[PDB]
Paper text:
Growth of the iron-oxo cluster on the inner surface of FtMt therefore occludes the putative transient binding site Fe4, preventing the binding of incoming Fe2+ substrate here. Most animal ferritins are heteropolymers composed of H-chain subunits, which contain the FoC, and L-chain subunits that are isostructural but lack this catalytic site. Ferritins such as HuLF that lack a FoC exhibit much lower mineralization activity than the H-chain and H-chain-like proteins.
They are composed of 24 α-helical subunits arranged around an interior cavity where an iron-containing mineral core can be reversibly stored. The ferroxidase center (FoC), an intrasubunit di-iron site, catalyzes the oxidation of two Fe2+ ions coupled to the two-electron reduction of either molecular oxygen or peroxide. Mitochondrial ferritins are atypical of those found in higher eukaryotes in that they are homopolymers in which all subunits contain both a ferroxidase center and a presumed but undefined core nucleation site.
Numbering used by the authors:
A (entry chain A), B (entry chain A), C (entry chain A), D (entry chain A), E (entry chain A), F (entry chain A): 5 to 176
Amino acid sequence: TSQVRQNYHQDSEAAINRQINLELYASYVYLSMSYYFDRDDVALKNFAKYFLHQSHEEREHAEKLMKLQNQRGGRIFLQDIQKPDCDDWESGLNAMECALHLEKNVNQSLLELHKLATDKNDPHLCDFIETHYLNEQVKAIKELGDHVTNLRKMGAPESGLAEYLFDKHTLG
Amino acid sequence: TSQVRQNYHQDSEAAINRQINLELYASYVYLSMSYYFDRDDVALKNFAKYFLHQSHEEREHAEKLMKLQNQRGGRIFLQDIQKPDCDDWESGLNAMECALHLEKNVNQSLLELHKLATDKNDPHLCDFIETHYLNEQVKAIKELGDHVTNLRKMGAPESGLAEYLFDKHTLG
Amino acid sequence: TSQVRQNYHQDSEAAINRQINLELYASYVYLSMSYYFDRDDVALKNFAKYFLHQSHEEREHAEKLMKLQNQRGGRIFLQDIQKPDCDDWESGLNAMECALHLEKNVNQSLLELHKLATDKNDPHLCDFIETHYLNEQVKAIKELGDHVTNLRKMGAPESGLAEYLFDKHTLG
Amino acid sequence: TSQVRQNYHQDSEAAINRQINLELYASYVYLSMSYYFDRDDVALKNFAKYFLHQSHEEREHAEKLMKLQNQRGGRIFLQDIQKPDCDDWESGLNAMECALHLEKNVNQSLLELHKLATDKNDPHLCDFIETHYLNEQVKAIKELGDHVTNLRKMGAPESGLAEYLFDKHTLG
Amino acid sequence: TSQVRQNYHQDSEAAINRQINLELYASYVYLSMSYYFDRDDVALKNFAKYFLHQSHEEREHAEKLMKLQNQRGGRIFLQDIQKPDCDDWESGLNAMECALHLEKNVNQSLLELHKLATDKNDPHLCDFIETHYLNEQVKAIKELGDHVTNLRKMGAPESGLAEYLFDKHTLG
Amino acid sequence: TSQVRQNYHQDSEAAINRQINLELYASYVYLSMSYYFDRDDVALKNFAKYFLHQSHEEREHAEKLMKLQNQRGGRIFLQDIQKPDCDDWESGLNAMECALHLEKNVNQSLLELHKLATDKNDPHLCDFIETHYLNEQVKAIKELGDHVTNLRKMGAPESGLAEYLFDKHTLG
Ligand SMILES: [Cl-]
Ligand SMILES: [Cl-]
Ligand SMILES: [Cl-]
Ligand SMILES: [Cl-]
Ligand SMILES: [Cl-]
Ligand SMILES: [Cl-]
Ligand SMILES: [Fe+3]
Ligand SMILES: [Fe+3]
Ligand SMILES: [Fe+3]
Ligand SMILES: [Fe+3]
Ligand SMILES: [Fe+3]
Ligand SMILES: [Fe+3]
Ligand SMILES: [Fe+3]
Ligand SMILES: [Fe+3]
Ligand SMILES: [Fe+3]
Ligand SMILES: [Fe+3]
Ligand SMILES: [Fe+3]
Ligand SMILES: [Fe+3]
Ligand SMILES: [Fe+3]
Ligand SMILES: [Fe+3]
Ligand SMILES: [Fe+3]
Ligand SMILES: [Fe+3]
Ligand SMILES: [Fe+3]
Ligand SMILES: [Fe+3]
Ligand SMILES: [Fe+3]
Ligand SMILES: [Fe+3]
Ligand SMILES: [Fe+3]
Ligand SMILES: [Fe+3]
Ligand SMILES: [Fe+3]
Ligand SMILES: [Fe+3]
Ligand SMILES: [Fe+3]
Ligand SMILES: [Fe+3]
Ligand SMILES: [Fe+3]
Ligand SMILES: [Fe+3]
Ligand SMILES: [Fe+3]
Ligand SMILES: [Fe+3]
Ligand SMILES: [Mg+2]
Ligand SMILES: [Mg+2]
Ligand SMILES: [Mg+2]
Ligand SMILES: [Mg+2]
Ligand SMILES: [Mg+2]
Ligand SMILES: [Mg+2]
Ligand SMILES: [Mg+2]
Ligand SMILES: [Mg+2]
Ligand SMILES: [Mg+2]
Ligand SMILES: [Mg+2]
Ligand SMILES: [Mg+2]
Ligand SMILES: [Mg+2]
Ligand SMILES: [Mg+2]
Ligand SMILES: [Mg+2]
Ligand SMILES: [Mg+2]
Ligand SMILES: [Mg+2]
Ligand SMILES: [Mg+2]
Ligand SMILES: [Mg+2]
Ligand SMILES: [Mg+2]
Ligand SMILES: [Mg+2]
Ligand SMILES: [Mg+2]
Ligand SMILES: [Mg+2]
Ligand SMILES: [Mg+2]
Ligand SMILES: [Mg+2]
Ligand SMILES: [Mg+2]
Ligand SMILES: [Mg+2]
Ligand SMILES: [Mg+2]
Ligand SMILES: [Mg+2]
């Protein structure tokens, strides 16, 4: 047992390891999305940059959870990082819709994590999740919803012109 | 009676209190408009910023009238600030059309106020209204008419692309 | 239903709309207070500035709640902003006592909002209220209590000298 | 009763006074530790500096709780600050082990305080404890565990060379 | 026996440990005083700042004596730091009168310490006390007497106005 | 078929996708290593920083291969990123030995990739591998061998002192 461990339930430790994997998975999804828009037959450079930045942010999310695990005296256990569900993301709109669904799924996992931390009376872990994850998620979900809405109203995915102009004006 | 009061008719005092309420009402209309465009299913960020700035300007209008009331020795009497007529503003074009109608209504109130000040031979109040309100109104009405015209010619409200591009190029 | 909405109870949405109205009401109370001290027969310029700044802060409070409503996928619904209970605030001490009572009332509303968010297991909303409102309120209540105490010990409201000197040394 | 007091349970007030005493006690323990390493027969200058800084941080912890007590309208009640359990701390490793045990004890007190604030539905006090104390404690406990581990692996306490080199490279 | 010890009497060593405790006690008295003036029903912010600074100075006094003990090869022995005699300090004037009495008591202890160092022919300890403590005490006693005098002549403690104005002009 | 594709064999395209996975795997190994040294019972902060930087470099390696795939008109196909072979890396020396073995394995894959590009007469791909990977690998392998050698000669893994001092002087 770790000399630093205090009020840190084994179930919370396990849940944190599951969350680490999920954040790394989200990083992988956004990495895949990014280079889809770098294809010569897609060629939306600011979509590509946007998703690559999101990919890097998700890796930071994972790293901060790994730091937390050690801070509390838990032990990191890593799993395979599953490949993303799509190889082909079809359109800027469809990728944004997938990212929205991804972020809502990660949010649900974080909310279940917070419920567990609450049930185990772990206020430090509750505050950690609230402080570093829950509002980040709300902002990410809101931004992706905003993007989806604009692309739809602009005429995407049918209008390749719309995706092009969104790439320049919103993501550029 | 106030030691500063001079040539300030009771009717003018009352009219100034009515104008204070109207300016606060205009501030509220623009506040509502602003956050309509912040909705995830509308998502026109520069419409939102534009109307929020207009909201703040209207509050300044109200404050300067409250200052005038005290400068002249009248007594401020506040009324409820009525909620705006619309919860849903439908489109960027429709919001601009509503703001145009609002500004023309506030202008009419200011012109009636000026007629009263003229009838009561209050040149200080006439100059105050002319100096700080009447040309501000003309410029605001002209700008909103310009915006309405551009949105119409661009294809709004049917073209969500038009509202998007107007948001970036004129309001951005 | 909003594409961004997740774990956001209809009751919380309604409570947030009620809180928006209350913050706008507080802004109106402080606006009224401010210009009372700008009257030529009151003439406490730093009381006036202090309350005007508080008025502007309350509008910011309202705006941040409107932003939150949209972030979470709720829909803003505005109500009339009621006029303040007093036209005449009588003295610097009495205005500070009224502001203290106002802030304690707004605090109670925020604490009921937090209880609801807790009952609905909304940790994001709990953190939002804690982060942006609850300590702001505690600090505001403490500052107003401090001011009330000083004015009382100085001899207010009987001593117009006390209110004058407090205006210069504490609010100036 | 205090004019500022709102939703602040008498039990919480008492618990905050107990925590104030404990933080002052921790300040005293670290003060004692510091000057032990300033002895001519111990002479580890960076151990001494490290613990003196920790001592000053604990006094700041106490002061912020005294500020909180007044912010919420409770009344500070001070008790004797007990002398530390050890006059002689024996070795750099043993002092770090004692500081680790101290911080875990203070953490437990803070977690009991948070449970009480939760039971009394005091979200402001919960947020205060989370924001200013609980992660500070986790970081302090982790750092002391790190230090203990390094000193042990280096060969302390038997190796006076290890304590000397740790003083220069980690604490210097 | 310490390798550095020279001409340092066991009685002086013990007296220095007693003085360390007394300086820490004075630090505690001023800490208590400080937060009394931070109460919402007292609310003299510059009294609070003044006494908090005095508290920090007393801790520095204690630390320099702990340094001296080690410099001379004595061994620090700590005792409980007794809580201050008053929880309620009643008025700015009464707190200043108590601080004056405190400083005169600490001065008497220092003068007895100096007599002992003289009797034991310890010129280094005599010079240390003279250099770092005796004139600091005289200046502190003179300043507190000055403050008491001004508060009395101003009309304190009856005049809450006097304490308020002293807070701004002398302590501000 | 891609409009940009020229002299790019399907076998090379597949090999590049295999290399992408391997570089992401190496990133994961170094991520795991990094946080092993962040454990409170290991606590070698510069080992942790060193491996985290290596992790980030490997992700850059992967990204540049994804860019190459698109530049040449191939299509990225991602696979699961396998978890690292070790959860526990035991010692600084053992982690360096594992990283050395990892880099030699990645080098072998790159050399097989280069042989394939040579056999398919793809000089652009040969130059890409030589320019951006092969000397990076040689330098990485040499540096890790240097580190292993120093740790062994210093007395690792038995000497926890050696690993501590290596952490400060070579990795610090
Ligand atoms: Cl970054
Ligand atoms: Cl402005
Ligand atoms: Cl502001
Ligand atoms: Cl500090
Ligand atoms: Cl200092
Ligand atoms: Cl880089
Ligand atoms: Fe970022
Ligand atoms: Fe994430
Ligand atoms: Fe998808
Ligand atoms: Fe789903
Ligand atoms: Fe995310
Ligand atoms: Fe403007
Ligand atoms: Fe206006
Ligand atoms: Fe309208
Ligand atoms: Fe009309
Ligand atoms: Fe207007
Ligand atoms: Fe402010
Ligand atoms: Fe507010
Ligand atoms: Fe009132
Ligand atoms: Fe009431
Ligand atoms: Fe407020
Ligand atoms: Fe610090
Ligand atoms: Fe502490
Ligand atoms: Fe101990
Ligand atoms: Fe214990
Ligand atoms: Fe501590
Ligand atoms: Fe000083
Ligand atoms: Fe002293
Ligand atoms: Fe006393
Ligand atoms: Fe006495
Ligand atoms: Fe003193
Ligand atoms: Fe590098
Ligand atoms: Fe590589
Ligand atoms: Fe290995
Ligand atoms: Fe092998
Ligand atoms: Fe490598
Ligand atoms: Mg992002
Ligand atoms: Mg375990
Ligand atoms: Mg699979
Ligand atoms: Mg909570
Ligand atoms: Mg936050
Ligand atoms: Mg304008
Ligand atoms: Mg009248
Ligand atoms: Mg109505
Ligand atoms: Mg003009
Ligand atoms: Mg304020
Ligand atoms: Mg609804
Ligand atoms: Mg009414
Ligand atoms: Mg929180
Ligand atoms: Mg906060
Ligand atoms: Mg510290
Ligand atoms: Mg009580
Ligand atoms: Mg005892
Ligand atoms: Mg925090
Ligand atoms: Mg002093
Ligand atoms: Mg002895
Ligand atoms: Mg006692
Ligand atoms: Mg002499
Ligand atoms: Mg001198
Ligand atoms: Mg490298
Ligand atoms: Mg193919
Ligand atoms: Mg496996
Ligand atoms: Mg070449
Ligand atoms: Mg080269």
